[PDB]
Design a protein around this ligand. Structure first.
Ligand SMILES: [Cl-]
Ligand SMILES: [Cl-]
Ligand SMILES: [Cl-]
Ligand SMILES: [Cl-]
Ligand SMILES: [Cl-]
Ligand code: NA
Lengths: 231, 187
């Protein structure tokens, strides 16, 4: 089960297109809205090409299912309170896609990509514990729900990693910040061959969107930072 | 059709068993349990309109005549943390979920605050009972604790991070708004 785009920023009054492709063979597609604080609300169901049901949603929430059972949802006259994770499921047992996160803003003026930095292990920690912790900081970004992952020697690692469950606000009265830690044995850090990267997938603007302002258009992009094993 | 889930929140220490309940106001043809991952993906745990299923350390039992289902997690691991949903039924009706948090058993605590370079302060290797407070100062940043698992060494550890562009700020004073352990190593 597949959904595109991953993430989408729009503006009041615009139109949002959400795409979904079900598991091969499945003929039913279900759409759900997951809005922070309301849980999962049912939106639409399609079987064999047709609309079978609707949640409590006005006709500006529209869609369709294609002969191959793939489906799209079109949300018109977008409003701020349309911001949500939209989830697609197919076929008995329902299986979920990764969802399309929609953000609807008054304007694009506040979209900034992150700055990403990697902070190397304290020598004290290495002495005291035989272990080395790298810290990653992603700062100054908006909107949230970024994807931060660690990479060592070209491969994504999951062991020894911990990333904050939520971002914190930079002025709690607002752009965001995020941190993550990677711990390796001190021996691993002391190997000059070893290469560590903190990678942040930021979701921002696309071609579609209009940017005037002087700074770079804050496009959807990956911003990274790196560290080498001890020289 | 109403779908209630119990409890709403569950803090556990790894090793502990726990049970999530799901009640529903009517007869159902389908019931599913899910886990939601940090980036939004619902993972199917079980389809069980009636009976019992087992998969690894998870179990489910649905007493259909009495309109409820149990999700049983044996020896919770830190990796079990997240939100668990119960849904019944073509649309599914979801409950509001149980949020599960599983902390490590730190028998060998070793609290310490380090300075890192390339300005950041790391508080690490405390036990799970320690609470890390935010800063009252809006130009000082402190993350909540989180647990990492160095899988290959059977080793788990908690940490939080503080940083700031205030000159005043340093690692020695950084976690002052928090109840630090006494024996905390300051390098
Ligand atoms: Cl797609
Ligand atoms: Cl349409
Ligand atoms: Cl069509
Ligand atoms: Cl967002
Ligand atoms: Cl503990
Ligand atoms: Na984030």
């Amino acid at each position: 089960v597949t959904q595109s785009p991953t993430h989408l920023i729009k503006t009041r009054g615009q139109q949002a297109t959400l795409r979904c492709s079900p598991i091969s063979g499945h003929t039913s597609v279900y759409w759900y809205q997951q809005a922070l604080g309301l849980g999962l609300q049912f939106l639409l169901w399609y079987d064999e090409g047709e609309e079978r049901n609707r949640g409590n949603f006005p006709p500006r929430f529209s869609g369709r299912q294609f002969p191959n059972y793939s489906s799209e949802l079109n949300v018109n006259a977008l409003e701020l309170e349309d911001s949500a994770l939209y989830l697609c499921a197919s076929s008995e047992t329902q299986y979920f896609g990764p969802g399309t996160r929609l953000l609807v803003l008054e304007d694009l003026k506040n979209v900034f990509p992150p700055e990403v930095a990697v902070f190397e292990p304290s020598e004290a920690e290495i002495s005291h514990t035989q272990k080395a912790t790298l810290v990653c900081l992603a700062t100054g970004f908006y909107p949230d729900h970024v994807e931060l992952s660690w990479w060592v020697n070209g491969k994504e690692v999951h062991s020894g990693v911990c990333t904050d469950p939520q971002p914190l606000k930079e002025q709690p009265a607002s752009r965001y910040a995020l941190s993550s830690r990677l711990r390796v044995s001190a021996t691993f850090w002391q190997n000059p061959r070893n290469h560590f990267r903190c990678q942040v997938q930021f979701y921002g603007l696309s071609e579609n969107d209009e940017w005037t302002q002087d700074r770079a258009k804050p496009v959807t992009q990956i911003v990274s930072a790196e560290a080498w094993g001890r020289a | 059709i109403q779908v209630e889930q119990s409890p709403p929140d569950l803090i556990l220490q790894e090793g502990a068993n726990s049970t999530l309940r799901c009640n529903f106001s009517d007869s159902v043809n389908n019931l599913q349990w899910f886990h939601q991952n940090p980036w939004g993906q619902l993972i199917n745990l079980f389809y069980i309109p009636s009976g019992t299923k087992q998969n690894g350390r998870l179990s489910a039992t649905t007493v259909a005549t009495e309109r409820y289902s149990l999700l049983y997690i044996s020896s919770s691991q830190t990796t079990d943390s997240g939100v668990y949903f119960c849904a019944v039924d073509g649309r599914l009706y979801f409950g509001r979920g149980t949020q599960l948090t599983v902390w490590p058993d730190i028998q060998k605590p070793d609290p310490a605050v380090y300075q890192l370079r390339d300005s950041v302060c790391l508080f690490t290797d405390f036990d799970s009972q320690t609470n890390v407070s935010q800063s009252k100062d809006s130009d000082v940043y402190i993350t909540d604790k989180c647990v990492l698992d160095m899988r290959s060494m059977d080793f788990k550890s908690n940490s939080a991070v503080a940083w700031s562009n205030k000159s005043d700020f340093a690692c020695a004073n950084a976690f002052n708004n928090s109840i630090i352990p006494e024996d905390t190593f300051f390098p």
